[PDB]
Paper text:
In the RAM network, the hippo-like kinase Kic1 activates the NDR-related kinase Cbk1, which forms a complex with the coactivator protein Mob2. Here we describe the crystal structure of the yeast Cbk1–Mob2 complex, providing what is to our knowledge the first structural template for an NDR/LATS kinase–Mob coactivator complex. In all three structures, the Cbk1 HM peptide is wedged into a binding slot in the deep cleft formed by the kinase’s αMob helix, N-linker region, and N-terminal catalytic domain lobe.
In addition to Cbk1 intact in its HM region, we used a variant in which threonine 743 was replaced by glutamic acid, an activating substitution that is at least partially phosphomimetic. We also solved the structure of Cbk1(HM-E)–Mob2 in a crystal form that diffracted to 3.6 Å, containing two Cbk1(HM-E)–Mob2 complexes in the asymmetric unit related by noncrystallographic symmetry (NCS). In one form, structured parts of the activation loop occupy the substrate-binding pocket and thus occlude access to the catalytic site, similar to the structure of PKA complexed with an alpha helical peptide inhibitor. In the other complex, the activation loop is not present in the substrate-binding region. We suggest that this is an auto-inhibited form of the kinase, while the other state seen in one of the two complexes present in Cbk1(HM-E) crystals may be competent to bind substrates containing basic amino acids (right). Although crystal packing interactions around the kinase activation loop are clearly different for the two complexes of the Cbk1(HM-E)–Mob2 model, it is likely that the extended activation loop of NDR/LATS kinases switches them between an inhibited and open state, with phosphorylation of the conserved autoregulatory site S570 (near AMPPNP in Fig 2C, left) alleviating the pseudo-substrate-based inhibition exerted by the inhibitory helix (αINH). In our crystal structures, unphosphorylated wild-type (WT) HM region (HM-T) and HM region with glutamic acid substitution (HM-E) associate with the Mob2-supported binding site in a similar manner. Similar MD analysis of the Cbk1(HM-E)–Mob2 structure indicates that HM-E also has more restrained movement of the HM region within the binding slot than HM-T, but slot compression was significantly less pronounced compared to HM-P. This suggests that HM-E is only a partial substitute for HM-P.
Residue numbers in the entry:
A (entry chain B): 100 to 148, 182 to 278
B (entry chain A): 282 to 391, 407 to 508, 549 to 714, 740 to 749
Write the structure that this text describes.
């Protein structure tokens, strides 16, 4: 519909990959959080009315090969590919939730929390350019506030 | 009893504002982490040297993922009702490890120093907590005290002492143990002493157990006193030491630990704790008395000074007139010719354990017990810096 803009924090810094790290390990970390993040978010919204991909997300990250859980094992750099796909597993959830299911969410008036969280996911994406500006068609206008 | 209109809304799943208020932390935390990434620029500039490509590189680290079954179990080591400790190997790396399988519910009460057992991390399933420790190889003290009932002299002096210094350091670090009990004191590679910890394993003895021609046939005090080591434990925990400051009301403090010590010394000389009861509640009893009921047999051999210890060790936990005041003066007892109080840690140990290989459980009642009135029958990295 919908709504926006109350707030938490400033500004945008954290998402950049720190120095001398396998980006893959680094990638692999962050990607996993966002998963659990929405999980906990949907769980208020839960019922009142992806399992695969989150698990396909799960199963990606829980693939030892694509995912150097272990040590300073680097990542296949198709892991760098495994993830570029693995990320996009995620935006599906945000949008629809935000598109259709935000409705409920705002009633909660926890909105300033989901706002920063959704805003969050973005910053990593475009700094790391993990997505195309064309597939951005559904979410385009809101971003334009900045 | 009037009427009311909130109105609109209800609270349904309204408990997941947790999911709001909580991910605050997630951010608050997310903030201060990568500020710890500013630990760079250590830059000791006393160094005019290279250059020469890079002064570093990193992986850097990872929280990866985890669980049990990255663990291969070796032997049941020892037990409590909270659960079994165990010897185990890491499957993923592999190495020597103490696993104490402890209990999550139902359970109550809801570094840089050589002197104790060194834990590393905790991991758990639903049911058990798993404590993963340095595995102390010499056995507990108790299992030593059993194999031979120590003839001591310098030995109990030795096995003690480092007790104190450790306990000192503990106390000095602002902690009382209130468990000083032989199975809970630990002998290392060197046969030296690290004493571990309770975990915290709780539950405790109160309030009072009150029951209310002949024959005979005991035939010796010591004979009679053989009734110990009774079903391993398999209910427990007995009050070996249990300085009498605990019951009834609030109390204790370091005096309990030294009491516990002196009490421990008493056995290890006598081959039995001062208060040994033949029944769980026949202590308190004599323990509530001592004095007249602190009792040394007529098997004669003791020091005047050594006897003096345990008595003033088992004298009251009494404050006011006195000092105690211990851990030194406890260093200052006449029972001690030396030592340096220093060289102690490397000094030929009264037993240097002799083993065949790295896994040898020959120092434990590996045994089998397996009673855990719990099981039906049927992880994470949030830590900070690096090791090591
Ligand atoms: N860190 C450790 N390393 C090696 N052995 C240990 C360690 N901790 C305990 N033990 C031994 O294993 C037995 C049980 O573990 P322990 O901590 O002592 O039991 P618990 O559930 O804490 N309470 P308790 O068994 O009565 O002491 C002991 O009697 C010791 O033999």
């Amino acid at each position: 519909f919908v709504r926006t803009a109350l707030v938490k924090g400033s500004f945008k810094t954290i998402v950049q990959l720190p120095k001398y790290v396998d980006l893959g390990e680094w990638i692999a970390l962050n990607v996993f959080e966002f998963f659990t993040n929405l999980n906990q978010f949907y769980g208020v919204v839960a019922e009142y009315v992806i399992d695969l991909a989150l698990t396909w997300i799960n199963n990606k990250v829980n693939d030892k090969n694509l995912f150097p859980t272990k040590n300073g094992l680097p990542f296949p750099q198709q892991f760098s590919r495994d993830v570029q796909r693995i990320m996009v597993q995620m935006f599906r959830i945000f949008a629809h939730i935000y598109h259709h299911h935000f409705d409920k969410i705002v009633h909660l008036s926890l909105e300033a929390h989901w706002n920063s969280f959704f805003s969050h996911f973005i910053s990593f994406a475009k700094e790391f350019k993990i997505i195309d500006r064309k597939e951005m068609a559904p979410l385009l206008p809101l971003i334009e506030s900045f | 009893k009037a009427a009311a209109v909130k109105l609109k809304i209800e609270n349904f799943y309204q408990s997941s504002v947790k999911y709001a208020i909580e991910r605050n932390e997630r951010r608050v935390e997310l903030e201060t982490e990568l500020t710890s990434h500013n630990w760079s620029e250590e830059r000791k500039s006393r160094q005019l040297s290279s250059l020469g490509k890079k002064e570093s590189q990193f992986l850097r680290l990872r929280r990866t993922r985890l669980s049990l079954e990255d663990f291969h179990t070796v032997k049941v080591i020892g037990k409590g009702a909270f659960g079994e400790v165990r010897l185990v190997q890491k499957k993923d790396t592999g190495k020597i490890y103490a696993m104490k399988t402890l209990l999550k519910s139902e359970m109550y009460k809801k570094s840089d120093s050589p002197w104790v057992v060194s834990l590393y991390y905790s991991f758990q399933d639903a049911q058990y907590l798993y404590l993963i420790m340095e595995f102390l190889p010499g056995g507990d003290l108790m299992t030593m005290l059993i194999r031979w009932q120590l003839f001591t002299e310098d030995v109990t002096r030795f096995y003690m002492a480092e007790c104190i210094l450790a306990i000192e350091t503990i106390h000095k670090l602002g902690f009382i143990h209130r468990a000083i009990k032989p199975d809970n004191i630990l002998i290392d590679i060197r046969g030296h002493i690290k004493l571990s910890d309770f975990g915290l394993s709780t539950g405790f003895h109160k309030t009072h157990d009150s029951n209310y021609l002949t024959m005979s046939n005991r035939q010796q005090i010591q004979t009679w006193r053989k009734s110990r080591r009774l079903m391993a434990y398999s209910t427990v925990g007995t009050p070996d030491y249990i300085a009498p400051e605990i019951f009834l009301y609030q109390g204790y403090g370091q005096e309990c630990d030294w009491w516990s010590l002196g009490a421990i010394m008493y056995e290890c000389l006598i081959g039995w704790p001062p208060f040994c009861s033949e029944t769980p509640q026949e202590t308190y009893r004599k323990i509530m008395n001592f004095e007249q009921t602190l009792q040394f047999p007529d098997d004669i051999h003791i020091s005047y000074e050594a006897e003096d210890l345990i008595r003033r060790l088992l004298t009251h936990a009494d404050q006011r007139l006195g000092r105690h005041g211990g851990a030194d003066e406890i260093k200052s007892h006449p029972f001690f010719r030396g030592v340096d109080w220093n060289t102690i840690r490397q000094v030929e140990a009264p037993y240097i354990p002799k083993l065949s290989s790295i896994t040898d459980t020959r120092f434990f009642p590996t045994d089998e017990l397996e009673n855990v009135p719990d099981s039906p029958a049927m992880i994470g990295y949030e830590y900070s810096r690096f090791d090591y």
